[PDB]
Structures are given as C-alpha cells and as structure tokens.
Design an enzyme around this catalytic site. Structure first.
Site, PDB file in Angstrom:
ATOM      1  N   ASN A 126      25.930 -51.465 -13.622  1.00 42.32           N
ATOM      2  CA  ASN A 126      26.071 -50.153 -13.008  1.00 42.32           C
ATOM      3  C   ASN A 126      25.066 -49.191 -13.632  1.00 42.32           C
ATOM      4  O   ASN A 126      25.042 -48.985 -14.853  1.00 42.32           O
ATOM      5  CB  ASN A 126      27.461 -49.590 -13.127  1.00 42.32           C
ATOM      6  N   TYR A 145      41.289 -50.198 -15.757  1.00 44.63           N
ATOM      7  CA  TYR A 145      40.370 -50.671 -14.704  1.00 44.63           C
ATOM      8  C   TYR A 145      38.957 -50.720 -15.268  1.00 44.63           C
ATOM      9  O   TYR A 145      38.596 -49.850 -16.050  1.00 44.63           O
ATOM     10  CB  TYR A 145      40.451 -49.755 -13.469  1.00 44.63           C
ATOM     11  N   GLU A 188      32.661 -48.830  -0.877  1.00 48.52           N
ATOM     12  CA  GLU A 188      31.361 -48.230  -1.159  1.00 48.52           C
ATOM     13  C   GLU A 188      30.863 -47.630   0.165  1.00 48.52           C
ATOM     14  O   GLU A 188      29.881 -48.067   0.770  1.00 48.52           O
ATOM     15  CB  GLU A 188      30.357 -49.248  -1.681  1.00 48.52           C
ATOM     16  N   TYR A 215      -9.151 -22.277   5.605  1.00 48.14           N
ATOM     17  CA  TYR A 215      -7.922 -22.417   4.855  1.00 48.14           C
ATOM     18  C   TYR A 215      -7.847 -23.643   3.990  1.00 48.14           C
ATOM     19  O   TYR A 215      -7.211 -23.600   2.910  1.00 48.14           O
ATOM     20  CB  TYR A 215      -6.735 -22.429   5.844  1.00 48.14           C
ATOM     21  N   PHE A 243      26.951 -43.610 -11.016  1.00 41.76           N
ATOM     22  CA  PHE A 243      26.040 -44.571 -10.457  1.00 41.76           C
ATOM     23  C   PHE A 243      25.480 -44.136  -9.105  1.00 41.76           C
ATOM     24  O   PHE A 243      24.513 -44.760  -8.701  1.00 41.76           O
ATOM     25  CB  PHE A 243      26.699 -45.962 -10.283  1.00 41.76           C
ATOM     26  N   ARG A 248      -9.556 -21.839   0.975  1.00 46.00           N
ATOM     27  CA  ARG A 248      -9.093 -20.515   0.660  1.00 46.00           C
ATOM     28  C   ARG A 248      -7.600 -20.481   0.380  1.00 46.00           C
ATOM     29  O   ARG A 248      -7.179 -19.684  -0.456  1.00 46.00           O
ATOM     30  CB  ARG A 248      -9.442 -19.535   1.808  1.00 46.00           C
ATOM     31  N   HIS A 280      25.730 -60.757  -8.733  1.00 46.83           N
ATOM     32  CA  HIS A 280      25.088 -59.499  -8.497  1.00 46.83           C
ATOM     33  C   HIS A 280      23.584 -59.630  -8.402  1.00 46.83           C
ATOM     34  O   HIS A 280      22.956 -58.770  -7.776  1.00 46.83           O
ATOM     35  CB  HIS A 280      25.482 -58.468  -9.564  1.00 46.83           C
TER      36      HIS A 280
END
Lengths: 506, 506, 506, 506
Positions: free
Chosen positions: D192, D53, D411, D277, D326, D280, D83
């Site tokens: 990727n 794969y 996904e 503050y 990824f 300080r 893509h």
C-alpha cells in the site's frame, strides 16, 4: 509470396499480409504505359522550355522561374536532405515495408512523373528486405518520414538489414543498387504523400480487427463462465434493430457459442436472472465497434491506393495540376474513429472481468480463487485491467481537430494524421492486456465448473491458453500469466476462431 | 403534409422534415396486423397463466414472479412516475416532436406488445401540436426522457401548446384524449428505447449538413475574394485519390464556381502563386467531413427505424425475448463522429478568414477595410471566429468512451449517447458563427474588387447577405452584422445553392 | 452595503459579495493621486508633441505616427464600435456587475492613463444597477466583452435595468449620465484587460466552493445513512500524510459528524466491515479538490486586482511601456484547474449514491424504497446522477492548451481563458444535480433508520431538504424532488454548515 | 554522496539528486525509536490475542477473524505474489531507485508497523545499485508496482545490476542479503502506498523544470534573433499585475538578456514595431506555467514524505486505524496540472519558431537560409516542431477525472495517478524537441547578424549548441542537428544559466 502488382488495386487482405511478413513484389506489365507516359510528359515540358510549378521551377521567390537544368537535379537532393528532419524512435521494419509498398503503389499509378527505375529501386529494397530508417515523429499529415525513407536511394541516411543498421551504400549493395540521382519532379513525388499516415492508421486498423476477433471469443467464454444466456444473440432481435455491425456481431457469437453446450445445459432454468449489459449488450456495443472499424477501413483501403503526391501529371491531356491530395484529413478521422472502437472493445471487456470477480453476480467464488480468506486470486489483475481501460479514455481524444499553420502560413491547415494513427498502437496494447486478463479469468472460472465443457470453438480457446498458462490453484506470481496471455493474443491465437468474411482485411 | 406511415421506413429526408416543421401523421393500414398480433401474443401469455420476464412479472426479487393482474397495471404507472427523474432545461418542441414520431415508428413495427390505442394517443398528440415536457439531462443511453414524455398519456406531467405550458389533462383535451391506463409491457415499451439519443444526434446531423452546405458557398466566395484558383477542384485530381467524400465535394465547388467568372477572368496569370491549403485543400478536408457525416447518417437513419425497447415480442413464433437494443452505443459513436466533422468544417473556415485578413496573402487591404490607419475593420470579428473554432476542440472529446455502472451493477455498461449528440448543437453554433463571419468577410472583400461579379450561385450568396448587411465602409458596431449573418445561415439561406443528391437528408 | 474602494485591494470575500448581490461603491480618496497623475503624464506627452505607441498614434501603418488630436478622439470611438464583435447569449446582470467592478478596480490603480470621470461613469452605472449588454462569446483571452460594455458610455449598445433592456441614452439617464467622448488612451484602457476572463473563472471558483461545502454535508449524511465509520477522519491519519487540503477537509468532516451520534451509537461493533473508498477516502479526494480550488483562488484573487490593460503609464518616471498583461494565461489554467475539482467532487458523490443503491453494501433496502418488488425508488435518479457526472469528464478537457494566431499573426499566442471559465458553470450544474440526488438519497436512507438522529449539523441538513421534499413512500413523479433539491443547493442551503476559514472566499 | 535520512524531511532538491544519480543512504539515529515502537505495538497486539483489521486478520470472509500466526506469515507472501500483476515495459533504474527511496522514507516515519530490518534491506538494495524489475502499467493509484518491487526481498522476481537482469537470489547476494520472510502487517506496508504515482509525477516535475529553464534561454535567444524589445520584461509591468510566477519569470529574462547587448544596440530605434505575443507575452505565459509547476511541486514535495500505507499504527496511543492515505488523488491532479505547463511551454516555443521562419516578421531571410530559391532551410524542422506541440493538446487530457470501481466495488473510487504522471514524460519529449528546434533556429538567425553578440549568458547558450551543431550554410541532412540539440537539452546544457532559487527543486 510473389505479388504481381496492378497499381491502385491493393485489397485490405493484401495490406495485412504486407504488414505481417516480408514481401516479394514486381510491377505488372500493365503499369508501364502510364508510368513512362508520365515521365515523357515531364520531359516534353522541359524539352520545350515551358514552365510548370513543381516540375522545373524553384520555390519561394523562384516559384514561377524555370531553374536551369544544370541545378534542377541538385534541387532534388536538397529537398530530400532538408526535408528529413524527423525525430524520435525508429519505425520497426514491418511499418517501414508497409510505407515503402504504399509509396510504390501510388507512384506506380503513373500520375506522378517519376522514372520507372526509381520505383524499381524501392521494389528492390523491398525484395532484399532492406528497410530505411524512418523516425517516428515529424509529419503533420508525410514529408519527414518519406524523405528519411528516400535518403537511402541517394546513398545517404541508413538502413536495416537482418536486424542490423547498415550504411546506405552497403544497404543499397545488398539490394544490388548503387546511389541514385533524382530528376525533375522526383523529389516532390517521393516526399509528398500520405503513406506514413496511412500505414500508421492501417496498423491501428489491423490491431483493432485482431482485438475484435479476440473479444468475441473472450466474451463467449465469459458468458459461459458465469452461466449467462444465449438469448441476447437471437437473430430476431438484431434484425429488428437493423444495424449491420450488430447483426454480424451476433452471428459471430452464435457461431462460436452454438445452440447450447454441456456447461449451459447444466443450468436447468437459465432464465431465472437477467444477464448484465456487459454480456447481454455485447452485440450492440461490439456491433457499434464493428461499424466504426468498417467505416475506417473503407477510407484507409482507398487511401492505400490513392495518388497522394503533388503536382499531378495527366499525360493524356498534357496538363500538370497543383492540388492537395497530400492533405491526410480522411486518414486522421479514420484513425480517430478507430480510437473509439479500440477503447470501447476494452471497456466492455473490463466490465466482463469485473462481473467475474463479483460473487453476487458471477456464481463463482470471490475473485475466482478457492479459499479466498487467504488467497487474493484475480483481485489485482482486475485492477490492472481497469488501469489499462482507463488510459484509453484520454488516449481517444481526437488529433483530427487540431492544426497549426506551418511554412510561413502557406501550409495553413494540416491533418495531424500521423499522431492520430500512432496513438492507436498504444490503445491496442491497453485493450490487448484487458482481453488477456479476461481470457485468463473466463478460463479460470470455467475450470471451477468441474469437468464441464463449453462449445467446440471456445474449448479451442481454453486449450490455447491452457497450453501456456495453468489453472490458478493458490496465489502465485501473477505477472507472468498476463504476459503469456498477451503474447498469445498478439500472435493471433484467437483470430482464427472468428467466422469468414466479417472483418475488412480478414 | 399528411404522412401515411409505413413503420420502419422513414427516410432521412422525412426525418429532417419532421424536425423542421409540424407534422400530420397516420398509421398505414399495413402496420395493424403486426401491432395487434404483438398485443394478442402478450394477452395469450397472461390468459394461459405463463410467466414472462418484462410482460407480467415484477422486478428485483419478483423478477420471475407472476405479479397479479390486479396490480400489474399499477406497476405500469409506477414505472412511468419513478422513471421520470430527468433534469435541466426543457427540450424545444421540434425535438419533442422528433422523439414522439420516432417512438411511434418503433412501436408501430409491432414487436413491442403495446396496444394500437396507445400508439394512436401519441399520434393525436403529434397531430394537435401538443408537446410533452422533456428535460434535457438524465439519460445515459432513454428512460428519463421517454418517461417524462409518457407522463402526459397518464394525465400527469405537463405539455406545451401554442407556446404555453398546459396541464396534462387540458393538453390531452386539446388532442381529444382522456388520461390513459397502461397494460402489461406498455410501461417498458414506452420507457425503453433509443429515441431521445437518436433525435439528439439527428439534430446534430441536420446542423452538420446545413453547415457543410454553407461552407461550400462561403469557401467558394473566399476563393474568389482572394483571387484563388479553380485548379484544385479539377475532377482528375479527386478521381486519382478515389475518396468519394472528396470527389463529391470538389463536384460541388465546380458547380458553384463554374469554369470561370468575371472576377477570375480579371487575373490574367492566375497561376503565379500557389493557393494556401485553407482554399486549395478544401475538397480533401471538406471531403473527409462529408464522409464522416455520411457514415453517421447511415447509422442514425437505421436507428430511427429500429425496434429499440425490451423485451421483444415475436408473435409469429410465440416467443418473448430479453435482449439489449436499448443500448445506444452506435448512436454515441455516430454523434462523436459528427463532432469531428463540425469541428473541422469550422477550423478550415477560420483559416480562410485569417487568410482574408492577411495583406501578404489576401491581395486585399489589411483587415478588409479601406483606410486602415484609423479603422480596425474585421480585425476583432476574426478574433471572435478564432474563439468559436477553438471551443470546438475540447467539445469534440468523445462521450462514447465513458460509462458508469448503474442500477446496482446490472446496468454495468452504458452508451452516454445523449451527452454525445447534445454537445453537437453547441459545436454547430460555434461553426455557424465562424461561417457567418467568413461569409461577411468574403462579401466585403469581393466588394472591394469594384464592380466585379463572381459566379451565378455565389452572387446569389452575396445578394442574400447584402439584403440584410451593408458593405462595411468605416468602423461601426460590428456585433449586429454577425448576428444577422448567423440568423440567415440558421434559416437555411445558403442551403439551396448546393447541388442535388449530395447530403444524406437533402 | 457601501464599499469604499482602495484599488487593488479587493479580497475574495468582497468578490463573492459583488457577484452575489448589487453593490454601492465609491472611490477612496487615496486613489485620486495616481489616477490623475496617470492622466497628466498622458497630457504632458501630447502637450510636448512626443510620440507614444498606444497613446497618440494610429495603428497598422501609422503605428509610430502621431495622429492629429483632431481625430485621435474619433479613433477612441472607432475602437469601441469595431471591437464590439461579440456573439451569443447575454451575460446575466450579476456577471456584468462583476466585470464592471473589476474594470473599475484595475483602472483605479492609476497605471492606465484614463480620466477619473470615465471611471466614475462606470461606478454610477454600477450604483444605479444599470448593466450593459455583454454577449457571451468572442474573447480569446477580453476586447469584445469589454467593448460591448464600453459602448454604453458612448451612448451606444444597450443596457439592462430592473430586468428590461433600455437604450443606452435612457440607461445613462437612469444613472444620471450623458453620453461620453473618449480621450487619448481611453479606448485601449477600457478594451484591453482580463476582466471578462477573470469574472467567468471567479464565478466558477464560487460555484466550486459552494459545491465543496455541500459535498462535505452530503458526504457526512451518506456516511451515516450506510452506518459508516468516523475512523477515516481521525486527525492522526491526515497529519501523517501532510497534505493541507486533506487535513482541513477531515477537520470539516469531524466538525459536522462529531465523535458519535444516535445513529452511529446504534451499531455496537462498527468496525466489522471496511467502508468503501467513496466514504473512507473522502478526506483524500475532497482534500485534493480543496487544494486545486485554493491554487486557483490565489491566481484569480490576484488577477482581480491586476493592472491588465496596455500600454501602461508609469507617471512617477514619465515612461509609457508596451507589455502584455492582457494575456490571460494564468486565468485559463486556474479555470482548467477548477474543472478537475468540480468534476471530482461530482465523481466521488455519484459513487456514494451508487453505494446507497446497493443492498450488499448499504444495509438499506434496494434502491432505498420499502417494497421494492413493485416500486423502483431511487433507481433512475441514480441513472440521472451518472449521466451528469459523466458529462464532466469530457467537459474537463483543458482550453488552456489551445491557441490560434489572430490579427494577422501579431497576436500569435492567446489564452482561451474565457472558454476555460465558462465551461465550469455547466460543470457546476452537473455536480450540483449529482449532490442534490445524493442529499435526497442520504436523507431517505437515514429516514429508514426509524426514529434515529445524526449529528446536530447534519440534522439541520436533513431538515432543510425535508422542509421542501417529503420522504419517498411509494413511487411518485421523481423529477420535482430533484428540481427542488438542486434549487436549495443553488441558494446556499448547505453552505452555512461548513466551519469558518476553510474556503478562500468564505 | 552519503544521505543521512531524517524520515519525512526530503527536500525537492534531494529528490532531484536521487532521480538523477545513484545514492548511498543510511537511516539517521533519530528514526529508530518510532520505527521500532510501531513494531512493538503490532507485537503487543498479537501477544495479547486481540484482533486488528490489517494486522493479524485475513480478508474477505475472515476480515475480522484472527488468522493463526502459523499461516499469517504465508499470507504476507501470498499478498506480494498475487499483487505483482503489473504489465508493460520495465521502469528504468533511476525511477526504480526513486520509488525505493520514497518507500524507505514513508516506512521510516514509523507509522506502518514494519521491522527495521526490512527497511534496511531496501536500503542495502539501494546502496548496492540493485534495482528490482517494476513493470510500467497496473496501478490505478500502487499495489502492482510496489509488489513487483517487494518480490526481490522474498527472493522472487528479478533485478537489474550493472545493466543486467540478475535472479533475485544473486541480486540479493550482490547487496549482501538473503531472501526475507515477512511478518504481520509488512505485506500491506510494502504494497500500500503512493510511491510509484509520486515518483512518476516527480519525474514529470523535474522535466517540466528542465524545460522551463531551457525555454527562458531559448526565448531570450529568439528575442535577440528577430531584434525584439526588452521593454516587455520591465519589472514595473509585472509588479502591476501582481502574479508571482510572472514576476519571477520576467526577472529571469532580465538576468539573461541584460539592459542591452551588441545586437540590440544595433537597432537604433527598436520601438518602431510591436513584438508579437510569442515574445512580448513570455513573462505572462511562462509565468502561468511557473505557477502551475510550483503548485504541483508543493503537493508532490509533501507526497514524497507522506505516510501512505494502511492501516496506520499510532504506538503512542496504542491504536491501529484504517484510513485511505493510499488514494493518490492529489498526485493525479498535480500531474494533470504539470501537463498544462509542459504543453504551454511547448506551444509558446513553436510560435517563436514560426515567427523566425516568417520574413515579414523575422527581419531574417525566409526559413533562416541564405539563397532560399534553391534551399529549404529550417522549413521542415518547423513542421516537426508543429507536430510535437500538437501532440501535447490531446496528451493534456486529464486522467484525474476518470475512475472505475475495482475489487468488487469496495475500491469504488480511484485516482488514476500513475497514468497521469507517466504521460508527462512523453509530453516533455515533445516540448524538448520543440525547444531544441527553437534553439537551433535562434542560433542560426543570430549567426546571420554577422559578427554580433547577444548577452553573456545567451552567448554561452549559442556556444553550447555550436560545440555540437554547425551553422547551416546550404541544405544538408537536418535530422542529426535536431537529435544533437535534443540530447544537449536532456543533459541539462541550458539549466545552469537560470538564476538561483527560481524552480522548486533547483
């Protein structure tokens, strides 16, 4: 275009026109009485040696002290210069015009004590297409933005003309003006206001409307692409709920889809399966959005016409009163209200895109491409749509709940309106790209239903995209189609399809 | 109390009454026709052997399959049992009643196909003061909550009576009922709806109204404590802006303060200094809040009367249509709209508290105590007020922009309405404590203006607190006064002072 | 249990033990020198008639004035009483103990100038199991909470013993104490600190750890239920990334799953399909969470041992210096960091639940029930899981970015730490319910793989749930199984399965 | 500059250099073995007719099908083209270079199976200063961004050279390359990854460091302006707390301020009042920020060197394994962690600005101008600072808690890392403007302490601003001074003052 302004009567359609294109305006005759009476009331004050906070006094220590006329004019100039402490990128000319026209409209209601001449200078800057430089950041809700704008009337700062930055003196000369000197109360009358805040939220309103109109066409297209039903749009459903945003929304879907179409007629028994909520719940979700943007328009439509400076002059009674109309709270909430609507229009749209990619639900090939073993089709374009929709959740955090005490604790609660409306522009770009991708996907999927047609208005929608973006045959560079579809939406390609009297400014 | 319900006509006042106290209700005669016609349309469907999704079919695989009558009744019971998958703490009885009464009102509009008997069972549970156990969490916008509620009609789950948990069979016996068996469509008609969501947001509405009314009295008191002006409330200012929330708000301040008072008359020249925005901008800020809670009331007032289940039965035409009225989107936005209003009412109130502590602005001793070298006075109570107001910024993040796909992607966009309205309760406790502290501080400071009185309505306000909390002489345990002032506000001590017809449900 | 405390050396394991159960503590001999030297330095100051802010002065006007001894003791009592201005629900006894033990530990480092006797009183209250009433709200980051706690040492306020509220004098008598009188500096030494903030965030830490450990077992179970791969856990992958949180996380999955199991051995060719990211990306997501909770533990582990009051006494040099260790900023960020981890542990878990419901991905019947045409199975339990996970997005908004100026602008920037850690408890209940539902679903699905077993540690996980919750055969009331699974998780049923030395306090 | 890259060893200093300016890089000899062995393992796979794969298969339906070599090369090109579906504005060249260099570094670790030649093409594009067009939006955490980047290697898309857009073929010719054809696994190896996400967060890191360094100088200056104490920086305080971020921070203040200065020596009794503050508590707040940005640097420093593509090739064992490196989760949290630090650096800075405006606390004229009855001085510049700081609260909402299921639910959980790091750039502009204004104010106020000097490093700080911005005498246009101070900060004017080894990349 020749707007003859009756101050305080600008409609939201008038406002959208002003935001969209150049304007040629003139004061209506009826606005002179009040404008000049307001000046005369200020002049009688000074004539009689009376004191009035915000008219002829100083500040801080001298707040109740009648600063000498001799330098009460130099105080006007010091306010403008010291107040223009804005930061960030320049506003584009369209937004500078909307602000200028709102300042004119508020001052022209005649409660602010400013000379007619000074109002006419802003009008001549508008008529010449001379746009002061205004930085984006600074206001906590709009001294900084309005001071930067007013700098040009004194011959300071800078201005844009035919896309170029001109010096204030040349810019003024383009408009047939010469540097001005300001009188008692005019500094505060130009600097105090909610125009920058309102203009920013109005831009947000306008975009949310454009996106609403586009979603109804995109949504109608996706219903057709996946062989969805028209049943969920039935009036009887929406009437039984009683929500007005929802009734009108379903009425829009009905108008665009029709009773049926060639495509829909081709699914013998449509009823067989239930449509998922991204389609079936469109009237309820898009309805909630419609109501939100309507609630916001009503507050912003009134703000546009509001007398927003301080102190205010009521010449009919002789009184000058210090109040707080400059606090842009209602505008900040109106803007945080629009954020919800823009975000949810985008969310519902991304979910329709996701259904179109899913072969178990679409009744279309995986990722809308033939021969999916070697092509990826719309797979990454959906990814892009998810990116944009997600950005909007964080972006919808309200700015109206934040405040910080400024000016030594005298300005101890502020609106944050400007940050509220500005973030809507980016939200609208996010939803604009989601819708663009949906439009492309619905068109691609309908295309796969070889030879069939959708309704008359949705076909016009397919034809506008197909004029620029071809059917996707095999993988190719995907970016450019998205770009081209986004640009089409931004130009109002789909706005015209929506029926009349639905959206506030349309 | 004997409400004779004309279904779909509940007013927001009626809703506040129902939330507040027990109710005795009966169906008006006019609601029987439609309710029974809806049942007869369902019965004709089954009589004729026709199929109708959501009436006599199964689900999933059998969605278009006419499940046998013999087990179409067992499907009703399986839905209720499997759907009651709620979690978290039990709803209090007041909220359980509001939900029950809203389910009755929607079902009684006669579009849901449920037997009259079943509606009467919910009414008898209401009349006996028998409140089903409903867990707080589960709905994404209200299967879980409504299933848990419906469990008692089947003789399952459990119920509260006179503050004790009774078994469903005893509980039913208290109401003079016996376990019921459900018919075709009744499972979906009880389980599908937006009542839990609407009830939660309505509680939020009611609290935001109570807090608005209390802020106008607290704010009026603080104006007086620090010798503030009445000028900012002048009608002419608010009319020149045109914002309706703001006009009404200033009108409320005027009513409560009056033209002047003993205290105010005692500051010869009041004008000498400008009031800080926490006081002077009260009409603009509180005005924006009023509009927000009004925009939300209108959506929630309609939702209360909405037919929210699915599928819907239109017996006049013979049609049963599947739509999406169960999507509680408008309620989720209405609730996120109220979050802004509750948060900002609290913010403006904390800033008034901070001004009262500041000797450079209050015209009162440091931290409102005589002999401040050795006592700390209200110093830490202000700290507590800041804590609570700050919690509200994060709490105001919208829930309406989130969604997750459920039920295998068929329920691919949901409202998240329930989480939207529930977080308002905590926001309201936060602002309730801020207001409590302001009330105490304004009273303490007015007390230091030895012998002087404020207006007639503000004095009633001082007297209600002084009945429970003594003037602070020297340091003592501070907690208990805050506790006592919060409880007074929660009981509606200050609500009555606000003039009539201002807030939606009052 | 007999902790012999060496001040400033408490480990996170010691802290988890203290939060979990009663404690019996005593000061180690080595902490006496510094504690008493700190007192002697304060006594020499007063002996010599020298002035020291925060030791023998007053405040406000008298900040540099040496208040007479005669009433410098009454100042101690005024501080405690006036500072206890907290609000809301009472802290539970476990959290009251953790705060008490942290105050003891900071004071016992000997830099705060407080008598040993006073520290011993807190220890005797701890040893007797006598827990002061502390309200939840008030601190902006911990005067209010610590004052309420200190009230009992003066014989004021109230305390819990064997679950009942006792008066301070009886409560003190239970511990063998009598009301105390405080000396110079002791009021500030008890009231100034970050213990309430740290204890709240530590509770959040502990829960996030418990949920991490449960997610690794639930996740391992779901991998098995849907016949997922072990390949994504391979060490080589995680080593190539270099993220330590991720390496350790994958190592945990490997330990629990093993090289293979009966179930996994039964899928001849496992490789055929890719596992979705809810499973395959577990090491990367859960890894990021591990790092976040580790980053937070390191800051909180140090805070627990920190000298957090003010002014500080350095007896070795004779100096008393005013600083700001009471500012709980690092704790507020540590808590906002844990919010991200709790939210994402929940999100990844809801997505595993959603995959298990999807028959196209699970390789299991729709909604995990046999005969799904008439049963709904886990369908609404998934809905409940989505509700809870969504609530966490809004809840994760940071509190550490907000601040409001208090005490007349001297306390002009505060942490908001307390609100930061408290919201984690609710986030943890949300993720706890999500995990509960996943646990049930994974077990139900493995059960459907008739007769097969998962690894030795996951089977223990199935057996713990199966001891309380039966396999789901046909629809039944779903609530009670969720309730029972949540309670099991809250008791640490799954914590023990995780390998040693992974989580900070375990 | 001639970087000789040992892959996976880039330090954060090396990363800052790369982000800042052009680079000339070459692969070290030692990285060739693994890079080529990875290719040979892929080639042996295809040689032997084995299936793997992500190496020689197709997708979707053909996921386990060994696509013919003849068109396994055309699959590489289809992936890149389809893509590249990114959107929005172009990344600037500096960010394009950082991404390119990170892709080179990950691929060069030799676990991704890509030819050495292809890596060398990216290096030659870097060396020629040829920067591919990468759109800003698209990744959900980085297919889109990395595809757009890779388009140029195929001779598609477009590239920037000497500030102009060149066609890919001319651009390639500038680098001495010719369009490339991709081999098995090279499409996934370029597409990727987490480089876009990491580069965006690294830019955020770098800015937060620059702002930290500037805040310590600005803060030191403001301490001096208002005659503050050095006592709060004492090491003994910070050591007693034990927080490392805080210890180092105080050490930085000590280095810059010194034991005393002319200005400070001029306040006989400094002790008289406590510092607020905002001054300080600088070590505690800025300390918490330091820790946050250090926690984030450690995750981002490792991510930069991470093997982030998929599937991974382990040539030593012959295995090709599908994992999930990824998933950019740790980067998304690291970025949400930096948001807190940038926001709080800004908040503390705005509060110092507000103190400087307050004549009751500054010991300086109102709004830092002489003759304040007629000049407004810094009054509106403070307003601008409040605007910017407030914008950051909403901006700090986490993106890491959001996710949407993409690619048909395979996904199903993503990071949203890209949106996480990008929003930091705007947060940094917000805090950059706040600091700019503080710098101006501290300098103006010290200037009013006629003739006196602060320490040697703070005087360099005053001199850098005074080289560009004159003392403010009377009101003048305020914008331009802010602009000039912001630009100075952005150029690193104050970075050099901070001592060595404090910030991660410096």
């Amino acid at each position: 275009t020749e707007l003859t302004l009756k101050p305080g009567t600008l409609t939201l359609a008038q406002l959208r026109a002003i935001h969209a294109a150049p304007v040629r305006l003139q004061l209506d005759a009826s606005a002179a009485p009040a404008i000049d009476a307001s000046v005369a009331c200020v002049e009688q004050i000074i004539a009689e040696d009376r004191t009035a906070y915000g008219i002829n006094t100083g500040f801080g220590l001298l707040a109740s002290t009648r600063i000498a006329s001799h330098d009460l004019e130099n105080l006007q100039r010091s306010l403008v210069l010291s107040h223009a402490a804005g930061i960030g990128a320049p506003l584009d000319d369209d937004l500078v015009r909307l602000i200028m026209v709102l300042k004119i409209n508020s001052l022209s209601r005649g409660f602010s004590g400013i000379r007619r001449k000074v109002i006419d200078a802003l009008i001549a800057l508008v008529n010449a297409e001379v746009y002061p430089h205004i930085p984006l950041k600074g206001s906590v809700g709009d001294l900084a933005p309005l001071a930067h704008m007013s700098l040009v009337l004194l011959g300071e700062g800078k201005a844009r003309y035919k896309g170029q930055w001109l010096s204030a003196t040349e810019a003024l000369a383009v408009a047939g003006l010469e540097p001005l000197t300001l009188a008692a109360k005019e500094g505060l009358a130009l600097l105090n206001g909610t125009q920058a805040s309102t203009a920013y939220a109005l831009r947000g309103l306008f975009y949310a409307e454009d996106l609403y109109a586009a979603a109804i066409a995109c949504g109608g297209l996706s219903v057709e692409a996946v062989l969805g039903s028209r049943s969920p749009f039935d009036a009887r459903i929406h009437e039984a709920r009683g929500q007005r945003g929802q009734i009108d929304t379903a009425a829009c879907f009905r108008d665009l889809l029709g009773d049926s179409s060639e495509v829909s007629l081709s699914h013998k028994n449509a009823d067989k399966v239930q449509d998922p909520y991204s389609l079936r719940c469109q009237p309820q979700v898009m309805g909630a959005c419609l109501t939100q943007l309507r609630q916001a328009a009503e507050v912003l439509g009134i703000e546009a016409n509001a007398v927003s400076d301080n102190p205010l002059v009521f010449a009919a009674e002789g009184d000058v009163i210090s109040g707080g109309n400059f606090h842009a709270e209602p505008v900040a909430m109106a803007a945080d209200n629009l954020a919800l609507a823009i975000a949810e229009i985008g969310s519902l749209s991304e979910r329709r895109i996701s259904l179109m990619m899913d072969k178990h639900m679409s009744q279309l090939p995986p990722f809308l491409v033939e021969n999916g073993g070697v092509n990826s089709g719309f797979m990454i374009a959906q990814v892009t749509a998810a990116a944009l929709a997600s950005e909007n959740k964080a972006l919808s955090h309200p700015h109206s709940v934040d405040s910080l005490p400024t000016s030594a604790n005298q300005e101890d609660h502020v609106s944050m309106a400007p940050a509220a409306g500005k973030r809507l522009w980016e939200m609208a770009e996010n939803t604009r790209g989601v819708l663009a991708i949906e439009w492309l996907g619905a068109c691609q999927g309908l295309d796969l239903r070889k030879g069939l047609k959708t309704s008359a208005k949705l076909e016009k929608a397919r034809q506008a995209l197909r004029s620029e973006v071809a059917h996707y045959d095999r993988d190719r560079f995907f970016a450019p189609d998205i770009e081209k579809a986004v640009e089409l939406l931004a130009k109002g390609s789909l706005t015209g399809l929506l029926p009349a009297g639905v959206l506030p400014s349309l």
